[PDB]
Design a protein around this ligand. Sequence first.
Ligand SMILES: *[C@@](C)(CO)[C@](*)(O)[C@H](CC(C)C)NC(=O)[C@H](Cc1ccccc1)NC(=O)[C@H](CC(C)C)NC(=O)[C@H](CCc1ccccc1)NC(=O)CN1CCOCC1
Ligand SMILES: *[C@@](C)(CO)[C@](*)(O)[C@H](CC(C)C)NC(=O)[C@H](Cc1ccccc1)NC(=O)[C@H](CC(C)C)NC(=O)[C@H](CCc1ccccc1)NC(=O)CN1CCOCC1
Ligand SMILES: *[C@@](C)(CO)[C@](*)(O)[C@H](CC(C)C)NC(=O)[C@H](Cc1ccccc1)NC(=O)[C@H](CC(C)C)NC(=O)[C@H](CCc1ccccc1)NC(=O)CN1CCOCC1
Ligand SMILES: [Cl-]
Ligand SMILES: [Mg+2]
Ligand SMILES: [Mg+2]
Lengths: 196, 233, 222, 204, 212, 125, 222, 195, 195
Amino acid sequence: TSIMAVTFKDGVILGADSRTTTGAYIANRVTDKLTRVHDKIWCCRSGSAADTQAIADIVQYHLELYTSQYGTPSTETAASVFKELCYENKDNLTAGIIVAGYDDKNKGEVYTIPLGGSVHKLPYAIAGSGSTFIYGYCDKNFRENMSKEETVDFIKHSLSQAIKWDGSSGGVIRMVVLTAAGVERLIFYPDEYEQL
Amino acid sequence: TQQPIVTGTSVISMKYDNGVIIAADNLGSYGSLLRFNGVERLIPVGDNTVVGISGDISDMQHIERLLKDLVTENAYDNPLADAEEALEPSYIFEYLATVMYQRRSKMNPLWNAIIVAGVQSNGDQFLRYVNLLGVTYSSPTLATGFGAHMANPLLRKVVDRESDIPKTTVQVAEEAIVNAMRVLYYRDARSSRNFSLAIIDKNTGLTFKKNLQVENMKWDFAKDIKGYGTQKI
Amino acid sequence: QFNPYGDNGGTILGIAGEDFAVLAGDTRNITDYSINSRYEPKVFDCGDNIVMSANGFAADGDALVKRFKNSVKWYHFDHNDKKLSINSAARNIQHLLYGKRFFPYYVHTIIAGLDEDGKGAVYSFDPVGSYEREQCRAGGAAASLIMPFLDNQVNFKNQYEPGTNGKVKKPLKYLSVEEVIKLVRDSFTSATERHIQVGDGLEILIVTKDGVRKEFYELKRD
Amino acid sequence: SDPSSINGGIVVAMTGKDCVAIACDLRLGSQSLGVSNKFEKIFHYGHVFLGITGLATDVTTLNEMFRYKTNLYKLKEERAIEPETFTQLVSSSLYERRFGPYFVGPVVAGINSKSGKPFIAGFDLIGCIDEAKDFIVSGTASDQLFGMCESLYEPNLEPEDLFETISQALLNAADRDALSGWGAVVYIIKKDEVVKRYLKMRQD
Amino acid sequence: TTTLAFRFQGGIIVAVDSRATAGNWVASQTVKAVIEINPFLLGTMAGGAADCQFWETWLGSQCRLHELREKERISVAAASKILSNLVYQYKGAGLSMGTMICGYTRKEGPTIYYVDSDGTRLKGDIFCVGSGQTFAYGVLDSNYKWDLSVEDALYLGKRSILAAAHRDAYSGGSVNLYHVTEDGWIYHGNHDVGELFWKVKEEEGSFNNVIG
Amino acid sequence: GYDRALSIFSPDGHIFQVEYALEAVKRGTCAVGVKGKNCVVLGCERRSTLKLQDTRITPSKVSKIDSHVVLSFSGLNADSRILIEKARVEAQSHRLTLEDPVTVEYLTRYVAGVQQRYTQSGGVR
Amino acid sequence: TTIVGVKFNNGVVIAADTRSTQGPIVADKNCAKLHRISPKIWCAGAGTAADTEAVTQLIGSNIELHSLYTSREPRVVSALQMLKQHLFKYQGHIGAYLIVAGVDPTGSHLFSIHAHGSTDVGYYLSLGSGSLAAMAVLESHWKQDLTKEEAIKLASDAIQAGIWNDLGSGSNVDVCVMEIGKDAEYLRNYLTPNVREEKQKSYKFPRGTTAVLKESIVNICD
Amino acid sequence: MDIILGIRVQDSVILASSKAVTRGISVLKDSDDKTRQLSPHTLMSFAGEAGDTVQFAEYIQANIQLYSIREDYELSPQAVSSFVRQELAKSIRSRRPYQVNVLIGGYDKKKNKPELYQIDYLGTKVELPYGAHGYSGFYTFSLLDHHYRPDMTTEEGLDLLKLCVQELEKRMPMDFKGVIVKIVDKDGIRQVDDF
Amino acid sequence: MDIILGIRVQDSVILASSKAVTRGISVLKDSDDKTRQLSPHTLMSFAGEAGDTVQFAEYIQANIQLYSIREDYELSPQAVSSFVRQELAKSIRSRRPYQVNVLIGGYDKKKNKPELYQIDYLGTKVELPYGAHGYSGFYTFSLLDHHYRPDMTTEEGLDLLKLCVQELEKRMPMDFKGVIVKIVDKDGIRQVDDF
Ligand SMILES: *[C@@](C)(CO)[C@](*)(O)[C@H](CC(C)C)NC(=O)[C@H](Cc1ccccc1)NC(=O)[C@H](CC(C)C)NC(=O)[C@H](CCc1ccccc1)NC(=O)CN1CCOCC1
Ligand SMILES: *[C@@](C)(CO)[C@](*)(O)[C@H](CC(C)C)NC(=O)[C@H](Cc1ccccc1)NC(=O)[C@H](CC(C)C)NC(=O)[C@H](CCc1ccccc1)NC(=O)CN1CCOCC1
Ligand SMILES: *[C@@](C)(CO)[C@](*)(O)[C@H](CC(C)C)NC(=O)[C@H](Cc1ccccc1)NC(=O)[C@H](CC(C)C)NC(=O)[C@H](CCc1ccccc1)NC(=O)CN1CCOCC1
Ligand SMILES: [Cl-]
Ligand SMILES: [Mg+2]
Ligand SMILES: [Mg+2]
């Protein structure tokens, strides 16, 4: 996997590749690693496909039950539920999750949750095997309060390089845009991003 | 006792009515890292043979040097080096097959899988495989690594047995090879889009094609796929 | 760690008649769950009316056959073109195999031909050189399936004369080349049904005083 | 220390014209040592026959267990259990011990009393059903039995002919296995008569 | 395997079975476990088939070279020691052999030497080697006397192999008998255990545990 | 290693080095062997130009090769010690492998074989 | 095993081969790998044979009870969710690899489930040892907007690729078509391209061949 | 624990069990009785892991004695053997199994027949004319195959048994310090003091 | 191979060595002589790994006999023991060491004294009044500490030796089939036939 989430002026954008592997065989070349846990709280999944799915399903259940009682949860609250599961079951899980959401008060927020189950709130986050190859690029090119189009280009160029160097990453580049306007899904095919 | 470091993935090939086709991508992987992108894994020997190599690249470069030296050695005191006493595909293969088996028998193998494709002096098609263990076999279609699992099934739909070879044209055969390379790009995590392809014909001779790309890919249906089960958005 | 051995599958079968002998083997070559070739012969005419097959790890099998063929060649040079008898060939092969006792050829070897009285002969070897002459022998992946069938149909084991209260055994007798090929074909079609490494094709080499003849038959390709 | 090949033994079952046959060897050993030549591996509950190969303690245990269950079945249902139903009971019971299984290779054989149809089935140690028209094999000489049965068998054999085919399949397979043999028994099963024959075989 | 050889009034009896196995798979029922080193020396074979076959054939070549050089037959002691000294050089390499070198000479009389792959060399009157050795020992020990007739001795050796063939799963097939005298060895036939068992059961009244 | 062929044929078909070795034997003190009906006796000459000798410690002319075989000689004394040593070693080696002491013929054949080897080996006389 | 699933215009089709293995041995030459969870929800299973049957029957049982409780036709996502949560709980120890497909009031669906509890969505999927051979065909010939007859052809062609090229797969091709508004049609042995050829000889024995020691009538009655 | 034998003859069952108890390089005792009376006409010998053997034997003994008191009736050897087998069959899949092999020699008073059952630690039961556990069988079975007849007397059985012990004393590596022999018949259980 | 003992008394050295040769669960021989005469007044007993024992003993025997012929003179027990120790000392650092333990009993004709040397497979030499190899020592040493006196006769030594064998036969787990006893004194080497 190569995944990332980036905050910007109007909110936050999640990005991911579409490759699922079993050794060197690509079990799924059109995977959707960007998953909804609430209307405007989504997550990027890396690590075990089984573990991350089971976790995301439980979180979605918790946040649905939260909403029934206490109304819309914060992105911090969602990240806390993810953490609780990842930390307390750290011995049996292989999950690297990035939580991203849009509040009206707090705007765009990004929380990353590595293997140990620690939580880290950041302006932007990168994760997955392919992230290693773009630490240098992303650090040099990221700016706060970018526009939607700039953020889309930043994610596109970044994941393009991650995909280029990482054999465990590839396929299409999926993106999910979270703003006050709503939820927008984006897709970008090889013929476009490869020749960037 | 070795472990391969910089590696090359599948090599695929097949026979057709007048000759043989062989192909392999231009990638030199370093584990999961797709490190080197300008690697040529098809190596011509003379104007009638092409050796396709997968596996360890350092050992591939060693084999290149052996084949290059073989051509030099054959020319020594040989007035018919470019005629009757030129190197045949069968000669080149048997040499490599001898080396591979000797190296495995010394517990120090050349960590490769090799396919020697060519046309003999009498016009007969030559296509034979050899690997790090010294194991050899021949078939109308041959492939290494993932190609064995994914390409062979596709190529065998064209040439399922010996009698299908005269019925298969170079246009049909090349089409199948190029299609197979696309499928490997879809499904092999250590493959690249860029590849080389070689045709050895008994009439038109050796045609070596570089810098080919996988094209006419299907990705559009991906936009319709959402979530992993229930998710609607 | 590097493993110098491999399993190329396949199975072979040698039957001896009165004035002939057959050595059959399927033409399928495999690694793990993949097919490498649907027609890769592993039964060879080695000269002097000797046919040979070394089944198991193909690289070791090819090396052995190659060395024995070369042994036959030098036997002619060193001994005034004398014909290498099947028994002399067997003993020579023992020394080839045992010469690598501490790094063996992973093959079951079988040879067939005629003895010095003109009668059919089959010899079978273990990987390190122990050999024995037999009327009947199956080797390879499906040997466990085929061999007890041969015991029953070739050597008439467990078969008693009807009405004799299981006191009189069914009498041993030589089979015709026609009856033997029937058993070979039925042996391999049965093995093909129940063993995944067996199929594609069947190549039989028949040996008489006249020479070495070949016969080929299709097998199921699944 | 492989539970399925400590005691040794084999079972085979075949179908014929309006009949079924099931057969087994009589050996029970402890690896190389032969201990008993009277250890029958075929049992019956009403008209349903069950053969069991593998670890002998589990063979005995399962016989006692299916006798237990079929006796209660009959008391509640007021009728004898049929082969198709029994087959499912065996599968259920084995899978109940999925992560601590009985090391066995059972084989069901019988004729449905209502439809008159011949029925045989085989299982793995965790209960996977292997239904078949022709034959089922089980034991330490299963490879040998597969080879004999696949070549000797033909459909619609009469009881008297079927007896010869199954007996020869068992005998010649048992003689190529060290851990099987030491006697044999064959059950020929017709709609309303059952014949049991002990075979003469080599005792080595 | 089961092989035995014992010394008695009338020379030496050698008896072996004919089974060979690869795990539980019975590879052969017709193996020659007695190897004829020469017209006067016999060697039994147990353990590795190839190791025994190869080196005891080699032994016969060395014994032939001895009598060419010395113009005299090789002693059983000298023949057994050539084999034992050879396998001792290969100790640790993984040879598997349990053999009995049996012979009759003037100076020695009837002599048996147990020779094994870990270097052991023992002279003795009675030896049983193989996976079924214990079963054969039981019958042999309880019925053995020095003053056995040649007829009774041949039967005892045959009966002891049968005992092992019956109980030991990895023993059976047939029984090969040999009688060794000063003038050489005499082969006393191949005896299928299938027919031999029932014959012995009926005539002797033994094996009541078996249904006949 | 010194390789020179010292023992070689001459035009008349003689190997002079072997024949000159016989002259050295002819120079040596006389030695005689006589065998009776139940015994053998080995007699040996000792030259009397050497007085003030210590006969306790002086090497004896007759040497035991084993407890049942003896060896006397004529010729170069230093050379004899080498043959005697080799013979004694072979005597023990024979007992070890054949489990029986050497015959007199066998021991002789061995010693004679050693002597012959030195007539067509390079670098030796 | 080779199993596949292909979506089309008005529904979904799944297919499977019919070989069951026990190591290198073919245990069942015609086993059914297509399972019914509910009338219009079917499942193709690969991996541990007992696990795929047991888990498909358990979820099928609970789906029936759920359908009765809710007075509604069962949905594929319910079977999917129930299966994956069961498989996840056992951490891969239940070796069931499934392709789940069907039609329900929501529409037509196609999923795959792996032993550890991960699910995938697709228009075409393949699982089992012959999945690579099958996927090669699917990647070569699949397109959007397939008809019923085109999807059956593509599915069976993908299974055939596994039958011929994968040693783990063989024998026949089973198919199940689940179309919207129609009853699901289970096509057992849709293709039978591996029929055993006539044997060369009949091995029917003369009566009395087998030696017998004892006979006795067995009492099956009360 | 090592050698236990059993021979069923015409009118009785004879059990022979070694007297040695060895731990390390020391024979701690040479007069150990490796048997327990389960009921007046049923005797069980045992061999296996230290501690487990006696603990198991006495546990079975207690259960059979409890049954006898409750019903005022003696269980048949067949019934006792089945009870014992089931206990071992349970045991083998426990957290820590009983590593004990047993022979059960009994006289059925209803049938007027002697009965010998051999049960190993896995719960593998067989009725036999003669039986053994451990390495003993590798010598005795072939010997008994030859010399055993079904119609033998108790005295003939004891001579047959002496023949087994002699063979074991000749060919066994370990010194097992002889055997305690006990006879089970219609009149109950008694010990042979001079063997 | 297992039990070898040695006792030096006033005028002689007595060696006792077990007769059993065991392989697996079978006693292959019960009359094995685990000793070789190195010279007329020097005897060596041995025990250890199969094959190595005899091969080593005979190799030493050949070397000492060669020396005797060459010099027409018998080496002293001290000299022979030192030669043997050095061979084992070389061996222990070889590719495949001799796993053989020996006792060397000899009578020195120049000193007119008996001498007993104990040498293990490492090349560890000690001169002792009494010695043993293997598990035998664990019983015999304490017994000899109590009963042994330096001025004992050969007959007293044999009775002392009988006391050791009896204790071994009582407490040792394995049956070693008795011992062959040999005496070394001024008149050379002789075997006690009735022990
Ligand atoms: C990139 C690839 C790596 O960072 C991404 O993180 C993606 C995440 C997406 C899918 C959300 N990761 C994967 O694709 C993931 C890679 C992986 C593998 C093993 C452990 C962790 C991560 N792949 C999987 O989870 C596959 C998905 C299946 C094919 C649908 N599952 C496997 O590879 C299973 C995993 C078993 C497992 C191991 C350890 C922890 C949890 C689960 N492994 C196998 O099936 C083993 N396989 C058997 C056949 O022989 C080859 C090995
Ligand atoms: C009784 C019968 C059992 O011990 C006897 O001891 C007999 C004596 C007769 C055979 C002379 N012994 C055997 O039968 C002996 C058992 C044995 C095997 C291996 C080591 C020690 C003892 N059997 C063999 O040696 C068989 C003889 C064959 C069946 C003719 N051979 C094998 O098992 C061979 C080679 C084994 C081996 C020995 C040493 C180094 C390497 C290998 N193995 C195979 O044939 C396996 N298979 C052959 C087909 O190709 C794939 C490998
Ligand atoms: C293709 C053919 C292979 O990939 C398919 O995937 C099919 C699936 C269909 C049948 C639903 N798979 C098999 O046929 C499968 C392959 C396999 C084997 C072993 C482990 C995993 C997968 N075969 C089986 O499941 C057979 C079914 C038999 C023929 C009825 N079962 C076995 O081979 C069992 C394995 C049981 C098992 C237990 C615990 C964990 C995993 C598997 N093995 C045995 O029965 C062998 N043995 C017999 C002697 O007694 C001891 C057990
Ligand atoms: Cl996923
Ligand atoms: Mg196939
Ligand atoms: Mg047997």
